[PDB]
Amino acid sequence: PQAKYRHDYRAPDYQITDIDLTFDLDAQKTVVTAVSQAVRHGASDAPLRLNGEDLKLVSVHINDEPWTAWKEEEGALVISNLPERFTLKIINEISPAANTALEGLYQSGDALCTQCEAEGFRHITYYLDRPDVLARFTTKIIADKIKYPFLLSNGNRVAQGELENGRHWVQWQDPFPKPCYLFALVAGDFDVLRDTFTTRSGREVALELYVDRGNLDRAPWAMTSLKNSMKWDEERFGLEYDLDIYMIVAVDFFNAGAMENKGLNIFNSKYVLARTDTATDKDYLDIERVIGHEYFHNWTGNRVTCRDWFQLSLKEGLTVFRDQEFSSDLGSRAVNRINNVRTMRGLQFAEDASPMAHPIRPDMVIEMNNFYTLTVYEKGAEVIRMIHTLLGEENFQKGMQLYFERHDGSAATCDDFVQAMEDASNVDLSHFRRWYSQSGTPIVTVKDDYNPETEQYTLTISQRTPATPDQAEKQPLHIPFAIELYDNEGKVIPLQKGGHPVNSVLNVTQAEQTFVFDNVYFQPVPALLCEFSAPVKLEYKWSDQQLTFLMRHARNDFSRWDAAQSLLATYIKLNVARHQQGQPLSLPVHVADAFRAVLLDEKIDPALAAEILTLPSVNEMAELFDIIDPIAIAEVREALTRTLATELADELLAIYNANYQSEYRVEHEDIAKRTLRNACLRFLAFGETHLADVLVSKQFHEANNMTDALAALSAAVAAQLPCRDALMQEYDDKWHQNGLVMDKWFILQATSPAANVLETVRGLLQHRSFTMSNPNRIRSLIGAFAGSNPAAFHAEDGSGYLFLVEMLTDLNSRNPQVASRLIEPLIRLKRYDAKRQEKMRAALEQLKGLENLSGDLYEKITKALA
Numbered sequence: 001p002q003a004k005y006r007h008d009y010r011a012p013d014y015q016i017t018d019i020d021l022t023f024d025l026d027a028q029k030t031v032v033t034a035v036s037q038a039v040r041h042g043a044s045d046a047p048l049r050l051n052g053e054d055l056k057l058v059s060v061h062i063n064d065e066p067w068t069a070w071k072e073e074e075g076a077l078v079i080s081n082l083p084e085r086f087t088l089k090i091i092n093e094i095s096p097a098a099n100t101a102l103e104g105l106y107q108s109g110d111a112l113c114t115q116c117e118a119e120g121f122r123h124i125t126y127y128l129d130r131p132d133v134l135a136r137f138t139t140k141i142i143a144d145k146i147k148y149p150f151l152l153s154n155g156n157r158v159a160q161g162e163l164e165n166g167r168h169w170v171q172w173q174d175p176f177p178k179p180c181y182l183f184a185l186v187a188g189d190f191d192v193l194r195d196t197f198t199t200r201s202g203r204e205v206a207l208e209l210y211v212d213r214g215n216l217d218r219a220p221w222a223m224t225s226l227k228n229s230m231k232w233d234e235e236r237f238g239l240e241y242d243l244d245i246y247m248i249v250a251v252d253f254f255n256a257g258a259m260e261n262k263g264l265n266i267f268n269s270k271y272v273l274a275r276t277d278t279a280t281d282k283d284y285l286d287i288e289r290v291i292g293h294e295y296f297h298n299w300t301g302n303r304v305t306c307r308d309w310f311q312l313s314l315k316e317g318l319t320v321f322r323d324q325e326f327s328s329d330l331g332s333r334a335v336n337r338i339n340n341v342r343t344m345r346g347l348q349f350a351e352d353a354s355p356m357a358h359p360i361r362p363d364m365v366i367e368m369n370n371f372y373t374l375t376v377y378e379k380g381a382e383v384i385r386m387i388h389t390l391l392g393e394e395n396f397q398k399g400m401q402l403y404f405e406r407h408d409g410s411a412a413t414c415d416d417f418v419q420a421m422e423d424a425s426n427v428d429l430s431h432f433r434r435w436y437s438q439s440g441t442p443i444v445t446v447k448d449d450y451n452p453e454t455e456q457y458t459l460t461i462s463q464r465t466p467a468t469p470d471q472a473e474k475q476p477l478h479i480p481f482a483i484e485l486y487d488n489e490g491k492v493i494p495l496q497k498g499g500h501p502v503n504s505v506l507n508v509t510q511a512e513q514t515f516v517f518d519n520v521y522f523q524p525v526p527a528l529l530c531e532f533s534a535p536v537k538l539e540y541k542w543s544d545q546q547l548t549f550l551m552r553h554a555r556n557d558f559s560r561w562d563a564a565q566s567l568l569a570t571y572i573k574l575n576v577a578r579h580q581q582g583q584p585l586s587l588p589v590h591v592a593d594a595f596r597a598v599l600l601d602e603k604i605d606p607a608l609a610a611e612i613l614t615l616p617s618v619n620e621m622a623e624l625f626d627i628i629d630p631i632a633i634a635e636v637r638e639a640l641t642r643t644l645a646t647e648l649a650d651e652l653l654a655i656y657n658a659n660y661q662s663e664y665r666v667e668h669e670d671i672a673k674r675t676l677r678n679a680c681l682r683f684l685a686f687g688e689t690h691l692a693d694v695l696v697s698k699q700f701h702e703a704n705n706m707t708d709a710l711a712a713l714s715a716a717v718a719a720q721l722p723c724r725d726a727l728m729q730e731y732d733d734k735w736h737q738n739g740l741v742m743d744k745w746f747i748l749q750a751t752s753p754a755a756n757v758l759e760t761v762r763g764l765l766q767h768r769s770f771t772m773s774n775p776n777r778i779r780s781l782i783g784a785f786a787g788s789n790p791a792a793f794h795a796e797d798g799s800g801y802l803f804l805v806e807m808l809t810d811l812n813s814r815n816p817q818v819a820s821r822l823i824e825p826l827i828r829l830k831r832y833d834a835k836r837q838e839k840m841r842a843a844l845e846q847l848k849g850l851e852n853l854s855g856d857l858y859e860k861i862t863k864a865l866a
C-alpha cells in the first residue's frame, strides 16, 4: 500500500457539521443511513473524497436529489459538482458477522459493538474519516428486542420506540462535536452495574457499567476506580465530567485495551472484570490504570482532539502521563516510577533501536495502528514529564489551563500544546521541541572531578543520539538532568556556584558541556539522572561501593532501586560472557551482601524492597548488549536467581513468613507486603528442591486469592518443581470455562523454561479454552511465546520462527492488527547473531510473499528487510 507524510497535512476541502445516523442492525446484514450536513470550503472543481472500506453502497443523495456525479474508486467515494452547502445522504450495507478483523462494527460473542480509532468509521459508512473533521452526532438504532434489548451510542437517550415484528429502536444525541474515531455503538444483552457520581460543582452523573450476564459480581472494582478517577481529575487537574451519563461496556473480543468513545467507553473485558480469586493485585492496579486512562481522555483527547494522526502523542503521551500521576497519587509513587522506567528501558529503548523507530510524532506512516506504540505512549509520556519537570507543578497546571482555554472544542497539534505550556510558564521550549521530531534514545556520558584545594566538583556531561533506521541526522536535545550530591555521612551537599544556589535539574542542551559546583566540602557520591529525569541511557563509571552507598543512603527510593540495577547490570554482563565460555556464575560477596542488607533492613518500605529483589526482565537485560544472546541471558537470570536463593536462603525464608497476611485487601500496604513475600517465594523456588516444592504447593492450595495462587503456580513452572504438572492440571480443571483466568495459564505455558515448550504450545492451539478468534487468547499463548520467551523463540534450529510464520499466515487474513502485534519479535533480527538473522530474514521473506499481505505487516516487514 501507500505511505502518508505529516508534512502533506492540509485543511480539508469540505467539512461536516452534523450527521444523523440510522442503523437497521442485524449481524449478517446491517443497513446504515447517514445524513450529513456539509460545507465546501475548497474550490468548486474539487470533489468530496469520502473514505470507505468493504461497503456496499446502496444510494447517494444530495439535498434529496439522487446523485449521478460520483464514482467509487479504491477505498473512496468521490462526489463532484457540489453546492457550497448541502445535505449528503448515504445508505450502505455492512456485515458485522463477517468482521473478523475487529475494526468498525463487529460481533463480540452475541453482542454487537464498535472500534473506530483510528480509521475504523470508514468500515461503517462513507465519511470524512479524519479527526480534524468534528460534527454533532445523532444516532438511531433499530434492532430485535430479544437479541439486542440494550441499544447504546454516545450521549443521551432522546427517543425510544417499539415496532411490529418484535423490534425496537432508540436514539442518542451527543451534544459535543466529535471526530468519527470517537463514535461508538453497542447492542446486546447485559447485566448493568449502576451508580452515580456528583462533580465538585453539583452535576449528578449516572454511571453505567455493562458486562455479560452473570458478571455483575466482578464489576464493582472498575466502578470504584471510575469514581476515583473522576475525583482525582477534579483534585489534581480541576477537570469535571461534562455529560449527564457515563457508560462502559466490557466486551471479550477486542484487539487492544480500551477506547475513550465519548460517554460510551468500550473496554477489553480484561481491564474491567475482577474478583479476589480470579484476578491479581496487578490486575486490580491495571484496571485502575486503564479506567483512569480512558476517563482522562475525556479532556486530553476528546474535549481537545488531534488535528491528524501524526499528532497521536498529543493525546496518548499526555493521557498516559495522567494515568501515571493518578496511580502514583493513590499508590506508591516510587513503585510506579520504578515500573514505568523498567518499561522505558526494557521495551521502548528496544523499539527506538528497531527498524520501526520513529519520533513520538511520526513523519511517515503507512498503516496507523502500527503507531500505537511504546514510543508514542510511554516515551511520549516521559516527554510530557520532562516539560513538567522543567516547569514545575504550578506552571504545568497554568499551561494545561491555557491549552484548554485555547483549544477546547477543536483539534490541535503537539506543537499547539507545547506552545501553550511555554506561553503560560514563560519557560522557553523551542529547543525542547526537538524531542517531538527526533527518534532514538540519547546517550548521556558523565565525567567528574573533585578538586579538594578549591572544594569544587566538576561534571562534564556530553550527549549523542546514534543514527536510526528512520533518520540519518541527529542533534543535541534539551535534556533535563537531575542530580543530588551526597557526602560521606549520607547527607546532601547543597549545590551552589559563586555563592548563589543552583537548581539541581541541569539544562544539558549541548553535545558537550561542563558544570562546576562550589562548596562541595567532601568528595561526593553523585546520584545521576534522578527519577529518570530524561529518557536516556546514562554512561557513568560507577564503582560498586558508590552504588551500594546509594542503596543505603539516597533520599529518593527510585535512586536506591536504580543504583541496585546498575550494580547488577555489571554482573549480568560478566556472566553472559561467562556463560558463552561455558563457565559458571561468578559474583562478588559484596554484591550478595548488598541484597542481604535490603532483606534485613527493618525500615525499608516493603514495596521498594520487593522491586530491588526483582531481577531485571530478560527484555531489560537484553538492552545491555549490542548483540543479544537470548539463551545466555535467560540462563544467566536463572543462575543469578539460584545463587541468591542459596546465599540468602535463611533471610529469604524469614521475610517470606514475616509478611504472611491472613486477610486479603487491595490496599497499598497489603499489596507491598504481598509483592515482597512473593519475591522471596520466587527465590526460594530456585533453592533446595524439597523445601521449594513444599512451600510452593502449600501456597498454591492454601491461597485465598489469585495473587498468591498464581505466584506459586508461576514459581513451580519457572523452577520446574516436581509439583508443577499437578498444579497446572488443577488450574485447568477449575478455570477452563473462564477466558481471562486461562490467559494467565497460557502465559505460563508459553514462558515455561522446559525444553519441550514449543511442542506444548502447538498442542495448546487445540486446548478447550483456546481459540484463534479471540485476540486475548492469541496473545496469552502465541504472543507470550514469541515475545516473552526469547530463549525458545530464538531456539537455534529456527523452530520458533517457523511457528510464528504459520500463525501469522492465519492472522494476516483474519486480524492484521493482532498479526502486527505478534510480528514484532521477528523484526528485531538485527540485534541477534548472523545465523539467527539469516533464519529470521528468511521467515520475514516468506511472510512478505503471502498472497493478500496486509498493510499492517507489509510496513514492518519491508522496514525489517531494508
Ligand SMILES: NC(=[NH2+])NCCC[C@H](N)C(=O)O
Pocket (backbone or CB within 6 Å): 115, 117, 118, 255, 256, 257, 258, 259, 260, 293, 294, 316, 369, 372
Ligand atoms: N484499534 C485500536 N485499539 N486502536 C487504539 C485505541 C487505544 C485507545 N485510544 C487508548 O489509548 O487506550
Ligand code: NA
Pocket (backbone or CB within 6 Å): 015, 016, 017, 133, 134, 135
Ligand atoms: Na466540522
Ligand code: NA
Pocket (backbone or CB within 6 Å): 229, 230, 231, 232, 233, 234, 239, 240, 241
Ligand atoms: Na473529573
Ligand code: NA
Pocket (backbone or CB within 6 Å): 328, 329, 330, 331, 332, 333
Ligand atoms: Na503516593
Ligand SMILES: [Zn+2]
Pocket (backbone or CB within 6 Å): 293, 297, 315, 316, 319
Ligand atoms: Zn489512550
